[PDB]
Design a protein around this ligand. Structure first.
Ligand SMILES: CO[C@@H]1O[C@H](CO)[C@@H](O)[C@H](O)[C@H]1NC(C)=O
Length: 168
């Protein structure tokens, strides 16, 4: 079986966080991110993976992944995937992308499916500080497989980037 145990709306990074450091200039570890190991409760042979989607406009790329725009001065590199940050999938484009191939819980056991979102600020153009307001990032949806079904359970959660400031 499967049930939604997370939050529909999720903020990425601490509110009003401040970060210090040619163009494009990339900054922040997992500081600006959201992580939750328990978003869906799964059991009895349920198989599930994750799809991720970024709604921000694409304004450039770096080493194979999109640079998403926030302001004409600030951009973002984004990763979505399974719970642990190191397993994040670098995001490109604005379509739903497979960000976690998935796994199946035991035939007679219960566990959970989590996720993580991480971003790193990028200075596209310069002015001394750069501020960013609360902005919608995108979403992540569970992807059942092997015949498993989501039934009427909530499959998608959304993410918003909390406001932050970048200091040169
Ligand atoms: C079995 O552990 C579970 O594996 C899944 C797939 O890697 C993770 O999404 C999930 O968060 C994790 N749950 C916990 C409590 O750690």
């Amino acid at each position: 079986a499967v049930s939604f145990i997370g939050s529909t709306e999720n903020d990425v990074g601490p509110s009003l966080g401040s970060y210090s450091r040619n163009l494009p200039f990339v900054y922040t570890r997992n500081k600006i991110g959201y992580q939750n190991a328990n978003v869906w409760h799964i059991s009895k042979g349920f198989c599930v993976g994750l799809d991720g989607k970024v709604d921000l406009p694409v304004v450039g790329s770096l080493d194979g992944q999109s640079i998403y725009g926030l302001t004409e001065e600030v951009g973002l590199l984004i990763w979505m995937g399974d719970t642990k940050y190191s397993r994040g999938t670098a995001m490109s484009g604005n379509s739903w992308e497979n960000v976690f191939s998935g796994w199946c819980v035991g035939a007679n056991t219960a566990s959970t499916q989590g996720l993580s979102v991480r971003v790193t600020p990028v200075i596209l153009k310069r002015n001394a500080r750069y501020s960013v307001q609360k902005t919608s990032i995108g979403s992540i949806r569970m992807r059942p497989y092997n015949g498993s079904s989501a039934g009427s359970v909530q499959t998608t959660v959304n993410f918003s980037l909390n406001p932050f400031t970048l200091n040169d």
